[PDB]
Design a protein around this ligand. Structure first.
Ligand SMILES: Nc1nc2c(ncn2[C@@H]2O[C@H](COP(=O)(O)OP(=O)(O)OP(=O)(O)O)[C@@H](O)[C@H]2O)c(=O)[nH]1
Lengths: 75, 69, 211, 82, 94, 855, 72
RNA sequence: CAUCCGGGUGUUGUCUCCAUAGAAACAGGUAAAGCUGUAUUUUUU
């Protein structure tokens, strides 16, 4: 077994490309690299990039995305 | 308090029905008490793949229907 | 309030008094109440013996209760040269397994077959201790509500373990011509290092009871 | 403890019915549940909110996204309640 | 429990729940945004962990509108309790 | 149809839970736990079952005043006159109970009360077969006796989930008067022992496997149950599991809401002791010893339970029991524990494979059930049957197969790999267990065990019933094996009927006995001497009573008790000489370890052999053993590999089988031999059938010759012997042992925290003959002996058979060398082999025994 | 190494912008203080209506649950 | 089969001690007794 927390930690260690989907919002996505970790799914994510979904790119700085509105992680 | 008993679904391909009439696929790798899924990454429902391994949040899950019996 | 009234028909006690009474009795009615003591000395056993015309060295004997008719007359079954006499096959057995070792059991009751006993009964000050066992190998729902052992409980347990009268803390009353005490000594299988006359008397008593 | 949860648990094994927040009714043998109504079912049909049905083997469901769970009439008689 | 309460109070005094407390103390008219499009211009009275509020001299502002239409309506209420989940942003106009 | 059913329902106890609901539940599997309560003699499993029954029902009929009070125990599942009077549970009379859990998930439980007394392991075996969980029970005091260990071992064969119930806390509290710490220690020790006995799993109060109890005083609990009742007020719901976990083991609790640090400070009394055992002790002491008012107050405060006005005026023991009942509520804790134990259905498949070979099931197309036991619940013969898959409705016509007809069937199927159903059965009625009634029901269902009334005619002892609808279905089907009735019969008795005008009646009764008691090899012999192999004395006696009172009602003669001896050799064979009316064979004594293994794919076989007895490759190749006796049959000459005459073996070994069944010395079976073929001089002119026939006698003859050569012996069986004496009476026991011929004391095991020297032993079954009674009398009602045969341990009957001088006395016992022969001669006489009151033994053929072995 | 809460703490007395749930509207203001539950307090709060400064509210307090993300 | 020697259970009546109203609650107050109770993913922030 590999828990979610463990996975998150691994991702953090790596600093690999991460693509986050937002909760109750299909059209927008985020793409960056995991810097932080918390007791909840909340994590701080430098080098982030907003993405409108293919139903390209947009400008975006460094961000911490809150735990409640996450859907996907991958790294 | 109780852990979700998904030991029967371990290392099986599962159609994760998630929020907003969306879908995810992939083989099940791990889980915890919140229902946060750890799975090997697959396509989003023609069809197209993103990521190598994926970690889905608990609240987003509407269902996770077993593809493999 | 420890009785019905001056009629003296029902009685009903508390513990300490009862315990005291039991203690007082102890010399007189020390009937050994480990049920197993009476294996082959229960009434049932005696009855069986009677209907089998069979003894126990301690137990009573009778007129045989059916026509003593032999004449089995040596068949291929029950020959000398067929069956094998490794075991002596005493009477003790024949009653302790009436349906097997005795053939043709007419009117023979099924007897008991009980478990062993493990107890401490001592006349010392201290209580609740491992006296003569073997030793082992290696918030709170109540704290400080009680300290576990009282003062009465030393004897309470003993009382609980006891013979008929005492184990009950209440009861009915009995004509004093009732309440045979010698009963309980003559039932108790006693016969080792008593003189023969005593043994005979005991046997007689048993017979009287049993019939 | 949650008496409806208890009821659900008891029902386990029965051909239960199950509608979500999305409005998609399932009907089938209940496999397992938890304190939070995290259901599983076997040999289960799945009705789409619009109309069309779809058969499926082993569904897992999350109680937060479950609206109401229909149990057969047998469990009315006994024996969780009193 | 008391200790916990005290701690909470301290936190409020220090962190993001300080401003609201201050406002309450002062009792000034303040505007509150909501989920369902309701600008609540009101006087603060009560306050707790969950950002629920007892409000006085309350003036809600919305737009009753089935399109195409543009209407701005607002009503006065004497005393009004409020739940925290509805609230997005509270602001003190000096 | 309906009226009759209604009537049946009426003649029964009305239950606290609804029977209809239970029935409904039984439709759905996973909601039916089949449990066999099983333990040592007088564990109090029957008592426990009674408690459960009481809990279930509103009011029970024969439940008198005294029993209610709690003086006499009530065994609701004693039933039968035999049992009521005897004190032993003596058959398998269980019951079916809807029980709630800690967290009330209702679940229907097929409970089965196995007997404890060793001589009824038959029943225990049956229970095991039936049951997928097995409630082992243990007496705290007598501890984990060898018997318990054996049961555990044999349950891990079956295989089954092992919930433990440590019953008789009361005895360590009250009788042994242990300090609470001491009691705790004892419990720990017991647990450790249990674990040791077990191979794979671990058992402890945590993880709901142990269930602490005392049925006399009438209370069972698990830690979890206790927590639920009396540690939910004080703690939040998040830290309850943790608390429970903490509770067991070398763990202490010094003041702190809610910590609880392992070790330690100032005062002793661990967590377990603190939060459980100590409380129990307190309850006991206050219940007996304290003034009542204070106790009542305490019970109002600490436990939230109210003594009624009548209950205050109870006598101590009854009162104590009542108090306990009030405390620890109607026993759901036990149920919960059971549930926790049963995986479920990971094990189930394995268990079914074990019973009836591996493969795969077929649900809808065909139903199959294991006819387990025939019994007499409501006078008439019922059959307790576990429907494994499918659903068996009333009046359905059903296939049947006695597990004698099982192996053969399998073989036939294999060979196969016109329709032919050999017997049938119209299912006249079906119902549930039990205790003192059959609750009649239309549908049997996959999972539940049920008494069926039509099933009997065709089968005896055990069986497989089914209802296929195709050839494919038939092919799919597997057949249950006969139950490994663990102990295996030894103890012989020969019946005659006193007035042989009624031999027929006896025969009829005998059949019933065979059916009803399934550990009863009843051989009908050639000379009208009907024979009964019981497990042992008590069992036999019980059976006799059943026969002589109920199932026959005749004056029935009964031989002094014998045993079956069996034929084996000490030295190897020295001359394979053939016979003609042409094969020669000769046999070697097998290695002890190998024999033991046997008692408990060619390449694989070879490997196994190598592992066991250091046998070579050639040896491995040659072998082809049979019967489960055991003998081993080796094809070990030179020419056989080139020859196709020695090829085609299936026919050849029939003779060998026969030989094994009925030996030379006694026509009493062969054991513990490795046979070796040395020459098979087959002529040119075949006529194949004729040749086969010839071989069938000839092989047997050859075997006999080999045995003769090998310095053969009759083997006695030995009873392994439990004796639970009070310590200082061990010398008496020793003396007793010395007094008889064969006997041995292997190990005096001191039981933990008792005066009871569990002094295991060996005794030859022959010289037993009421040994138990002797032991008990000598040891003034102390040390309940138990004799048994689980091991299947045989031994030499001391000395040399085939010696005409031998002995002196007829009526008396004979000396040991002499005895070697005497038994044999008597056995022969019994058989009808010798001719005369004076006679001898010798084996043809030929040439005057090779000129008396060349002088 | 850099967790979220410490980052947040660091970002006190500095510019921040916050996005919302339904009827999404960006903010822009200097951060006064924060807590464990992520309720915010800003000074000079400008209202970016999808990247359009509609109005300047000034001294404001944002409730945590509607918040989407934090940015410089 | 019967004979005594004892026994309960209620049906009653009679003799010696313990009692003791002729009716209270609504509407809620006072006093006591009997049970039920701290927002960050699955319920109510
Ligand atoms: N001291 C003590 N005695 C008990 C306890 N449980 C049962 N007994 C007594 O010991 C005997 C055993 O109870 P049973 O239920 O008859 O034993 P069993 O389990 O039926 O044993 P089998 O007859 O072999 O089935 C009875 O006479 C009970 O009164 C106990 O916990 N403590």
């Amino acid at each position: 077994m590999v828990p979610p927390i463990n996975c998150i930690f691994n991702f953090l260690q790596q600093q690999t490309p991460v693509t986050i989907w937002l909760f109750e919002q299909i059209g927008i996505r985020i793409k960056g690299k995991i810097v932080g970790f918390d007791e909840f799914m909340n994590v701080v994510i430098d080098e982030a990039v907003e993405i409108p979904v293919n139903s390209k790119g947009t400008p975006l700085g460094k961000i911490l995305l809150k735990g409640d509105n996450i859907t996907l992680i991958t790294s | 308090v109780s852990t979700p008993e998904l030991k029967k679904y371990m290392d099986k391909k599962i159609l994760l029905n998630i929020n907003g009439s969306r879908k995810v696929a992939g083989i099940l790798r791990g889980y915890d008490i919140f229902l946060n899924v750890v799975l090997d990454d697959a396509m989003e429902i023609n069809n197209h793949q993103l990521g190598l391994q994926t970690v889905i949040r608990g609240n987003s899950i509407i269902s996770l229907e077993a593809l493999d019996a | 309030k420890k009785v019905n009234g001056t009629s003296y028909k029902k009685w009903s006690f508390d513990l300490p008094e009862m315990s005291n009474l039991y203690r007082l009795s102890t010399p007189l009615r020390d009937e050994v109440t480990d049920k197993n003591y009476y294996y082959l000395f229960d009434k049932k056993s005696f009855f069986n013996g009677k209907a089998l015309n069979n003894a126990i060295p301690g137990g009573p004997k009778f007129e045989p209760l059916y026509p003593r008719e032999e004449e089995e007359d040596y068949n291929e079954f029950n020959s000398i040269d067929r069956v094998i006499f490794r075991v002596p096959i005493r009477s003790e057995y024949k009653v302790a397994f009436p349906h097997l070792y005795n053939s043709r059991p007419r009117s023979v009751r099924i007897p008991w077959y009980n478990n062993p006993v493990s107890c401490i009964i001592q006349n010392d000050e201290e209580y609740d201790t491992p006296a003569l066992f073997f030793d082992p190998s290696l918030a709170p729902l109540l704290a400080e509500e009680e300290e576990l052992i009282l003062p009465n409980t030393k004897d309470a347990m003993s009382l609980y373990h006891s013979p008929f009268p005492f184990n009950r803390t209440k009861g009915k009353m009995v004509r004093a011509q009732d309440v045979a005490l010698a009963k309980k000594w003559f039932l108790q299988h006693p016969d080792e290092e008593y003189p023969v006359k005593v043994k005979v008397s005991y046997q007689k008593l048993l017979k009287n009871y049993v019939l | 403890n949650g008496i409806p949860v208890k009821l659900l648990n008891e029902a386990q094994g029965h051909i239960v019915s199950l509608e979500l927040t999305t409005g998609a009714t399932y009907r089938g043998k209940l496999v397992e549940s938890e304190d939070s109504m995290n259901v599983q079912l076997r040999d289960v049909i799945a009705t789409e909110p619009q109309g069309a049905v779809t058969h499926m083997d082993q569904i897992f469901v999350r109680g937060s996204q479950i609206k109401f769970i229909v149990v057969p009439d047998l469990l009315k008689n006994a024996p969780l309640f009193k | 429990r008391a200790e916990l309460e005290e701690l909470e109070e301290f936190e409020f005094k220090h962190g993001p729940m300080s401003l609201i407390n201050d406002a309450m103390v002062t009792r000034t008219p303040v505007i509150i945004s909501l989920r369902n499009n309701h600008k609540i211009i009101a006087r603060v009275k009560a306050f707790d962990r969950h950002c629920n509020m007892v409000l006085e001299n309350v003036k809600e502002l919305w737009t009753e509108k089935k399109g195409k239409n543009v209407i701005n309506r607002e009503r006065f209420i004497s005393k009004l309790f409020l739940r925290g989940d509805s609230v997005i942003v509270v602001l003190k106009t000096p | 149809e309906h009226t009759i059913f209604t009537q049946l329902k009426k003649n029964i106890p009305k239950t606290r839970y609804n029977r209809d609901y239970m029935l409904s539940m039984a439709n759905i599997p996973e909601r039916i736990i089949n449990v066999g309560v099983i333990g040592p003699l007088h564990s109090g499993k029957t008592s426990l079952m009674d408690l459960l029954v009481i809990d279930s029902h509103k009011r029970i009929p024969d439940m008198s005043k005294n029993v209610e009070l709690g003086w006499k125990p009530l065994r609701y599942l004693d039933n039968l006159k035999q049992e009521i009077d005897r004190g032993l549970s003596i058959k398998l009379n269980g019951s079916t109970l809807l029980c709630t859990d800690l967290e009330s998930k209702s679940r229907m439980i097929n409970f089965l009360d196995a007997p404890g007394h060793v001589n009824f392991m038959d029943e225990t075996a049956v229970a095991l077969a039936a049951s997928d969980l097995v409630l082992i029970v243990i007496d705290v005091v007598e501890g984990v006796t060898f018997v318990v260990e054996q049961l555990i071992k044999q349950s891990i064969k079956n295989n089954v989930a092992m919930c433990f119930v440590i019953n008789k806390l009361d005895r360590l509290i009250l009788d042994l008067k242990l300090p609470p710490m001491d009691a705790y220690l004892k419990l720990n020790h017991i647990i450790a022992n249990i674990n040791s006995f077990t191979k794979g799993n671990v058992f402890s109060p945590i993880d709901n496997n142990i269930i602490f109890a005392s049925t006399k005083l009438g209370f069972t609990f698990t830690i979890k149950e206790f927590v639920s009742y009396y540690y939910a007020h004080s703690i939040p719901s998040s830290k309850i599991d943790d608390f429970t976990t903490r509770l067991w083991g070398s763990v202490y609790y010094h003041k702190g809401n809610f910590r609880t640090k392992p070790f330690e400070n100032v005062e002793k009394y661990p967590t377990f002791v603190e939060f459980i055992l100590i409380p129990l002790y307190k309850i006991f002491s206050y219940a007996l010893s304290m003034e009542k008012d204070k106790l009542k107050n305490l019970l109002r405060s600490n436990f939230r339970v109210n003594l009624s006005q009548e209950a205050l005026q109870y006598d101590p023991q009854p009162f104590l029991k009542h108090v306990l009942q009030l405390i620890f509520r109607q026993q759901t804790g036990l149920v919960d524990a059971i549930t926790r134990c049963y995986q479920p259905f990971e094990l189930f498949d394995n268990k079914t494979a074990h019973l009836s070979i591996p493969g795969k099931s077929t649900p809808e197309g065909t139903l199959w059930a294991h006819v387990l036991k025939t019994v007499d619940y409501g006078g008439a013969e019922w059959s307790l049957v576990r429907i494994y898959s499918g659903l068996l409705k009333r009046g359905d016509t059903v296939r049947i197969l006695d597990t004698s007809q099982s192996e053969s069937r399998q073989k036939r199927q294999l060979h196969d790999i016109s329709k032919t159903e050999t017997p049938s059965c119209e299912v006249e009625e079906i119902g549930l267990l039990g205790g003192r009634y059959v609750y009649p029901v239309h549908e049997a269902h996959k999972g539940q065990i049920v008494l069926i009334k039509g099933i009997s005619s065709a089968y005896i002892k055990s069986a497989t019933l089914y209802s296929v609808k195709s050839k494919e279905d038939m092919k799919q089907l597997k057949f249950f094996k006969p139950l490994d009735y663990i102990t295996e019969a030894v103890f012989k008795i020969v019946l005659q009927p006193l007035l042989p005008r009624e031999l027929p009646k006896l025969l009829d009764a005998l059949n019933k006995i065979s059916k009803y008691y399934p550990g009863v090899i009843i051989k009908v012999e050639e000379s009208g001497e009907h024979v009964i192999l019981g497990n042992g004395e008590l069992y036999m006696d019980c059976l006799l009573y059943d026969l002589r009172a109920s199932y026959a009602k005749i004056e029935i003669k009964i031989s002094d008790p014998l045993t079956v001896f069996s034929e084996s050799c000490s030295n190897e064979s020295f001359a394979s000489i053939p016979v003609s009316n042409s094969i020669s064979v000769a046999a070697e004594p097998m290695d002890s370890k190998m024999i033991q293994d046997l008692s408990r794919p060619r390449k694989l076989s070879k490997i196994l052999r190598t592992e066991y007895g250091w046998d070579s490759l050639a040896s491995r190749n040659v072998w082809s053993f049979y019967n489960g006796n055991v003998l081993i049959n080796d094809t070990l000459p030179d020419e056989i590999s080139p020859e196709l005459l020695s090829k085609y073996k299936e026919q050849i070994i029939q003779g060998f089988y026969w030989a094994v069944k009925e030996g030379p010395l006694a026509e009493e079976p062969i054991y513990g031999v490795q046979y070796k073929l040395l020459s098979i001089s087959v002529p040119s002119d075949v006529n194949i059938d004729v040749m086969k026939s010839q071989i069938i006698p000839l092989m047997k003859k050859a075997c006999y010759v080999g045995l003769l050569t090998a310095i053969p012996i009759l083997l006695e069986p030995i009873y392994e012997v439990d004796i639970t004496v009070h310590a200082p009476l061990l010398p008496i026991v020793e003396e007793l042992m010395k007094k008889r011929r064969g006997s041995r004391i292997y190990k005096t095991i001191k039981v933990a925290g008792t005066p009871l020297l569990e002094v295991r032993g060996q005794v030859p079954v022959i010289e037993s003959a009421g040994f138990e009674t002797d032991l008990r009398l000598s040891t003034n009602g102390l040390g309940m002996c138990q004799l048994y045969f689980w091991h299947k341990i045989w031994r030499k009957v001391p000395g040399d058979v085939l010696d005409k001088d031998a002995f002196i006395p007829k009526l008396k016992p004979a000396p040991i060398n002499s005895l070697s022969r005497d038994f044999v001669m008597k056995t022969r006489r019994r058989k009808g082999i010798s001719t005369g009151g004076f006679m001898s033994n010798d084996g043809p053929t030929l040439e005057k025994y090779i000129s008396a072995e060349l002088y | 190494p850099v967790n979220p809460k410490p980052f947040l703490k660091g970002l006190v007395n500095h510019r921040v912008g916050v996005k919302l749930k339904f009827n999404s509207t960006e903010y822009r203001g200097t951060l006064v203080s924060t807590d464990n539950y992520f309720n915010l307090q800003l000074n000079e709060a400008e209202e970016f209506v999808a990247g359009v400064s509609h109005g300047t509210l000034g001294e404001i307090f944002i409730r945590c649950n509607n918040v989407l993300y934090i940015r410089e």
